């Protein structure tokens, strides 16, 4: 069964919503059990996603929220069904009878959309993702695997039982994973479905690669990151080593995100109240047979933008005006959100452009082992008895 | 299993439908398994294809489960089947001249 599962470890949200810590360790090792784990069909994901929706509309409030309002202005004229129902043309109240008789949608059934605009306050609120130990409610358990080559699916034999989860931090980041927990033995490559080339391949690292974005000057809204080259070559080398020792059997080619809405083209992350959109072309070039860009101090030019697209729902949001001082945003590169474009028969190679944009996928790497299970302590046995 | 015809250059419309009212993750593909769009939460990508710029999807319908696709500047190089995947609905719509 799947339930509401509360929070947390150690003045707005966690005071109102969460509990204090517990004196960990708290684990029970099980013996000859084999509990079937699937990561891609978990229902700890949606509860946590809605829980961070409950975070960031109470901790970092944008000044103006521009959301859709798509409604079926006066009248419920669409009715059960059929055709010859008008409404719209001149302003929003002229005639326009439509022809259907089965229905399929107008402007299936009709909706005239709208834009609710909302202005919220704006204190210049600070932010820090605190660790959230998700603790199970009364009469429930959180099962946990232990093998380090855990592919999400498959069965796990070394199944342990905790009462409450490990250190989990709310870090939204497209294009790249930040402040995540790494792997003990070796790197792991996943999918919901390999050969389907449309599910976000998650790669979780074992080498704690670091990243440094700072804002220097002479400009107000300019910043940049630096990453250690020859840590990045080793990381990409063992990533392509894994991807060549398992799934192809082909040639590799890396590239950048090939367009769309620009919060996926740039590495986007919030830090200190600033929404960094950093260019992520020069990181991805490892066209490598298995056998001019600043080769030691690799610089990522990064804009600060403050009319952002909501990952929370659909729509945009405007925050407070920017900061004056300089901000340190040293973090851990921990993983990658990569996609494919499988083909095409001459190649031979595979173009391996990155993806991302889901924030639920960025929770499946930290909701990594866990499965909510409900105990029932009642049993019936036919003994003698006396 | 629908066939839609646009002559040349004009806009044209394709629809997935979804009865969940959540704006869940979904994808469009061509016949030879190259992406054209993709939802990523509540964002918009494009496909690394021959339709990077001219492909478009109106966004506000996504909460209603209506998953559209607007293709612009039609010509001879669009005559192939496009396929939804939302949850399992592997449809087959076709465009012609």
């Amino acid at each position, epitope marked *: 069964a799947t339930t509401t599962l509360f929070c947390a470890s150690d003045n707005v949200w966690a005071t109102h919503a969460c509990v204090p810590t517990d004196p960990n360790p708290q684990e029970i090792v099980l013996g000859n059990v084999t509990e079937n784990f699937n990561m891609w069909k978990n229902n700890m994901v949606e509860q946590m996603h809605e829980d961070i929706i409950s975070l960031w509309d109470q901790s970092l409030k944008p000044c103006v929220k521009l959301t859709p309002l798509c409604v079926t202005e006066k009248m419920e004229t669409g009715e059960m069904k059929n055709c010859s129902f008008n409404v719209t043309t001149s302003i929003r109240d002229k005639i326009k009878k439509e022809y259907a008789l089965f229905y399929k949608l107008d402007v299936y059934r009709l909706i005239n959309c709208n834009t609710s605009v909302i202005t919220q306050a704006c204190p210049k609120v600070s932010f820090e993702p605190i660790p959230i130990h998700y603790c199970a409610p009364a009469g429930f358990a959180i099962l946990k695997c232990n093998s380090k080559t855990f592919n999400g699916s498959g069965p796990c034999t070394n199944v342990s039982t905790v009462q409450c989860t490990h250190g989990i931090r709310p870090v939204v980041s497209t294009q790249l994973l930040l402040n995540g927990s790494l792997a003990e033995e070796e790197i792991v490559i996943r999918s919901e479905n390999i050969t389907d080339n449309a599910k976000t391949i998650i790669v979780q690292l074992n080498e704690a690669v670091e990243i440094n974005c700072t804002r220097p000057n002479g400009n107000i809204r300019q910043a940049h990151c630096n990453i250690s080259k020859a840590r990045w070559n080793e990381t990409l080398g063992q990533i392509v080593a894994k991807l060549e020792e398992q799934f192809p059997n082909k040639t590799i080619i890396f590239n950048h995100s090939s367009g769309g809405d620009p919060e996926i083209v740039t590495h986007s992350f919030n830090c200190g109240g600033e929404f960094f959109y950093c260019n992520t072309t020069p990181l991805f070039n490892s066209t490598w047979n298995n056998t001019t860009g600043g080769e030691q101090n690799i610089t990522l030019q990064c*804009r600060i933008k403050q009319i952002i697209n909501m990952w929370q729902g659909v729509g945009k949001a*405007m925050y407070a005006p920017p900061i004056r001082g300089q901000i340190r945003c040293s973090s851990n590169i921990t993983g990658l959100l990569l996609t494919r474009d499988g083909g095409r028969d001459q190649n031979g190679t595979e173009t391996f452009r990155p993806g991302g944009g889901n924030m639920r996928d960025n929770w499946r790497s930290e909701l990594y082992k866990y499965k909510v299970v409900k105990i029932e302590p009642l049993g019936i046995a036919p003994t003698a008895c006396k | 299993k629908k066939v839609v015809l646009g002559k040349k250059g004009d806009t044209v419309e394709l629809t997935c439908t979804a009865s969940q009212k959540k704006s869940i993750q979904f994808h469009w593909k061509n016949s030879n398994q190259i992406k054209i769009l993709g939802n990523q939460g509540s964002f918009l990508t494009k496909g690394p294809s021959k339709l990077n710029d001219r492909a478009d999807s109106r966004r506000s319908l996504w909460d209603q489960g209506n998953f559209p696709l607007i293709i*612009k500047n039609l010509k001879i190089e669009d005559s192939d089947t496009y396929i939804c995947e939302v949850e399992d609905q592997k449809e087959e719509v076709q465009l012609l001249v």
Partner: antibody
Amino acid sequence: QVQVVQSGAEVRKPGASVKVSCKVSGFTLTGLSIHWVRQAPGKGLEWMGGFGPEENEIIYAQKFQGRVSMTEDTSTNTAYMELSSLRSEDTAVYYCATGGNYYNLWTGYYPLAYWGQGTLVTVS
Amino acid sequence: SVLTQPPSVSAAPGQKVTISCSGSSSNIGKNYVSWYQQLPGAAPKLLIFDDTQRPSGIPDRFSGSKSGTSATLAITGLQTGDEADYYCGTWDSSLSTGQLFGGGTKLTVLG
């Protein structure tokens, strides 16, 4: 119905500044809904600034690189365009142009439904 | 970035006449076209937005359309009432940066 009323006529010098106000009455101010367009007498319109699908810049149209500043006060329901370093063909007519309450969510291509009357800035 | 449209527009008042706005794929062959109306001396307004939708003042007197890489505007037969300037206007999606406007249309009648 919303009425948009610009600032008054304002005479400046070569190298001075100008702060054109834009009173808006009829909706509440967002931070995107106002573009600014110049017309010179003798040619067509020209877009000074406004917002589109790049996600912060009220974009400056490739000739305003260090002399312009555009800031929009949502509490007073009045916009305030600024332009410094007035030159030989900064002698034109300004327009505080405004898109209405129609299907805005995306704010890249929305046109300018509501308008000021046209302020005149002359350089003497 | 260029928006080539014919300057001199002269015809008989009353016979449904059309002019175009020509550009490129990054300018007009991708997005919506907004026709603006400017009286010769007064402040401009818009005529047609999203190529089919109109505000409360204009609607039925004009007809706009989008044909591939060129727009089309037409008057449905007035005389000297809307004899003014018109300006196609759209945004540029390339890093040729922003919102653009047409060069010039001198719509006059025979009189």
